[PDB]
Design a protein around this ligand. Structure first.
Ligand code: P0T
Ligand code: P0T
Ligand code: NA
Lengths: 594, 77, 50, 95
């Protein structure tokens, strides 16, 4: 009865059984929305059950009988109270069920189109979840229902708001970015919806610029796509062109065309590094997606980074020359450690402090970049380590500890390792340096642990059986087999002459198995290697280098000029970056080419 | 270990597999010099094997006709 | 490896729990293992997701 | 009329070297109807042997614009034989 009676009736959809006991709602002084009729397990109501079972011919009578009773809270706006499934409404079910007719009945009956489903299921979880946003408008767009969203926006009663934000501040466009997964089917779904909402946005809210809206974390949809790694939608937004009616909605324009020669004008509203928290800064450091290097090679990004790089080649090589001069003094001072020597030590101490302050400032500016991607900032720690040791070593020399000599030469060899960081500025060895750590060091580390287990495992057996004399010496002699200087022979004075040789012979065989298999293990990485992948890493490495040095040195925060030229498109002025291309298969902002 | 020419010459002998690494007892810093020497030996294996891998991709991603065409041009010249 | 160690150690043959949840399909009860997948190219035992 | 501007010269930057003559522009832009009218115009016909500022003729300009692209190669090859075929009818003596 009551709760059980109603749910069984609405499940079949018969309205005849619904007739009767409708006056009992007023007679019993109990409301349908109250907890008596809704299920206490999740707060689901009979209307939600009726919408679930499909259009249920009982939807209209159920809303008809409710208005007969005096209900302070409207049933169609009821929200589920379960923590896992919070904020879901009957409108969301109708949109999910892909029923355009059902959505119309609820909306025409006073349904709120701004109810938020803030349940744990609707949040971005690592487990079971579905983050379509938080609004009924976002659900229709994410589910690829163009008919529903058009009706919701153009509803004569209670139209949906495009600028309505989610619990995270995400708008409709933001939700499209989050649901992107770079799949060929998903990319078409997101791209098609993104332009459609933008086109409809001009007609509905011409004044409001939906692209400039930022969420609670201050990210525009273009910026959000870059950070989240959604390259497919990011590429479409970066270069976008439309027809005459939607020309201002575009970002890529044509300045002039002459035969096969064309010039393109990509917008730099939030892409140029001049503005704080730009796409380039977000991609290089804030972004943590594995396909981070695939973004810097895009059509407008590759040319912009190359233009920025060329303007700073001399400054980059000036730093390399200054660092090289620093080690010219360091090597000579280290060589003659035991007149100008006092001057040499003074310059080394200042140099150690100089790099220490700059590296500390670099880590002070950004710290999540090192944690997010240790591979990208591998040399950042090494420069800090060399600077710290050099400064510390000079302190011990002045402190008369006599302990400085091992530390001073440690910074010498470790610093010369840091000289290979500047090899990324050359296209020949810069790409070659990619396999130095990315391909090789990702697997050769495992072999070292394996070798020491074998090395120390055999060393203890060799020294114990022969008692060749010490654990340090036995391991040292076993290590000499790797460099081909091992000395294996049939000892005559050994108590167990044949046994120690057998273990030694067994050890020699294992290294050939170990070393050759290690050669084979990294062999497959080279064979199954993408040529563009190595090239893209180098482009990202240069992009990070230019961005860090564009801000200038730590003491002198030199002002940065804004790349591009301000010009009017049509009266809106947008900075644009010229890209010139030649297309022979083609068979304008300005008339005269320049 | 005594001269810059001799120290570099001994370090070069590790490439041909004739390097002599040992725990010196008369050295003032016996453990430290071995550690740097041990570090150097490890780097050559990284250097040489990566160099073998670096030129490995050239052979794998090589066009058979490209090598043949170069020889034809060489004979033509 | 997991199958051998699921039976437990030799001296202590620890009892093994049954993976999955017993539930009715339609009245037949069959143990089932939940697998969750996301498909964007698609364009029910229970009504309310859990 | 010759367009000897810096834009029409073979530059490493922004440029478009179609030659130096209106006849060369039509051939390089793949307009067979224009070039046929220009050559067979009853008044002031275009000259096939007219040279550019570099001495390049119409055929020379076709060579320069070639970029070995599949679309470009078809464009250059189709124009090259067409001009040669029309050259026999217009200027049989001139090679
Ligand atoms: C074929 C390889 C990779 C090496 C190449 C050089 C030579 C002489 C020995 C070979 C070899 C075996 O043919 C077999 C083993 C396994 C035996 C080790 C435990 C008894 C090791 C082992 O180095
Ligand atoms: C795996 C490789 C390529 C070689 C093969 C021979 C052996 C015993 C050493 C390996 C090895 C590491 O496994 C790791 C490093 C890096 C450490 C150098 C700085 C501490 C070097 C290093 O030669
Ligand atoms: Na050898």
């Amino acid at each position: 009865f009551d709760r059980d009676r109603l749910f069984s009736v609405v499940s079949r959809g018969v309205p005849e059984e619904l007739t009767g006991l409708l006056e009992y709602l007023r007679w019993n002084s109990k409301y349908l929305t109250d907890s008596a009729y809704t299920e206490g397990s999740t707060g689901k109501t009979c209307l939600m059950k009726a919408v679930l079972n499909l259009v249920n011919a009982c939807i209209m009578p159920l809303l008809q009988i409710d208005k007969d009773s005096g209900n302070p809270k409207l049933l169609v706006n009821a929200q589920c109270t379960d923590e896992f499934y919070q904020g879901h409404s009957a409108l969301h079910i109708a949109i999910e069920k892909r029923s355009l007719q059902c959505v119309k009945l609820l909306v025409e009956n006073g349904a709120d189109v701004h109810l938020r489903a803030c349940g744990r299921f609707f949040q971005k979880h690592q487990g079971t979840c579905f983050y379509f946003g938080e609004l009924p408008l976002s659900l229709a767009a994410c589910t690829k229902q163009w008919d529903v969203v058009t009706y919701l926006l153009e509803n004569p009663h209670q139209p949906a708001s495009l600028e309505a934000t989610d619990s995270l501040g995400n708008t409709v466009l933001h939700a499209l970015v989050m649901i992107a997964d770079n799949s060929p089917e998903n990319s078409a779904l997101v791209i098609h919806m993104y332009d459609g909402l933008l086109q409809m946005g001009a007609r509905l809210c011409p004044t409001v610029q939906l692209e400039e809206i930022s969420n609670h974390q201050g990210l525009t949809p273009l910026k959000l796509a870059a950070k989240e790694g959604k390259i497919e939608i990011f590429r479409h937004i970066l270069q976008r062109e439309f027809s005459g009616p939607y020309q201002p909605l575009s970002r890529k324009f044509t300045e002039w065309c002459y035969g096969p020669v064309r010039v393109s004008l990509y917008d730099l509203s939030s892409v140029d590094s001049w503005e704080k928290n730009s796409v380039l800064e977000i991609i290089a450091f804030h972004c943590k997606s594995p396909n981070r290097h695939r973004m810097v090679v895009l059509e407008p990004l590759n040319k912009l980074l190359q233009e920025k790089w060329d303007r700073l080649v001399s400054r980059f090589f000036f730093n390399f020359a200054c660092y090289l001069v620093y080690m010219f003094i360091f090597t000579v001072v280290a060589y003659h450690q035991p007149s100008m020597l006092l001057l040499g030590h003074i310059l080394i101490l200042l140099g150690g402090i100089y790099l220490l302050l700059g590296q500390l400032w670099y880590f002070w500016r950004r710290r999540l970049f090192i944690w997010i991607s240790f591979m990208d900032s591998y040399f950042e720690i090494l420069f800090l380590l060399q600077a710290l040791l050099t400064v510390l070593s000079q302190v011990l020399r002045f402190m008369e500890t006599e302990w400085y000599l091992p530390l001073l030469v440690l910074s010498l060899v470790l610093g010369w390792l840091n000289l290979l960081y500047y090899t990324r500025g050359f296209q020949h060895t810069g790409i070659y340096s990619v396999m130095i750590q990315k391909v090789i060091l990702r697997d050769l580390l495992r072999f070292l642990l394996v070798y020491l287990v074998f090395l120390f495992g055999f060393a203890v057996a060799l020294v114990s059986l022969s008692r060749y004399r010490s654990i340090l010496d036995a391991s040292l002699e076993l290590f000499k087999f790797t460099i081909g200087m091992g000395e294996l022979a049939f000892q005559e004075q050994l108590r167990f002459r044949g046994v120690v040789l057998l273990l030694l012979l067994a050890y020699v065989l294992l290294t050939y198995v170990l070393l050759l298999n290690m050669l084979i293990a990294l062999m497959s990485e080279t064979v199954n290697h993408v040529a563009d992948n190595s090239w893209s890493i180098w482009k990202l490495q240069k992009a990070i280098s230019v961005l860090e040095m564009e801000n200038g040195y730590w003491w002198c925060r030199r002002k940065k000029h804004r790349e591009g030229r301000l010009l009017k498109v049509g009266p809106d002025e947008r900075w644009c970056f010229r890209v010139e291309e030649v297309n022979w298969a083609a068979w304008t902002l300005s008339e005269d080419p320049s």
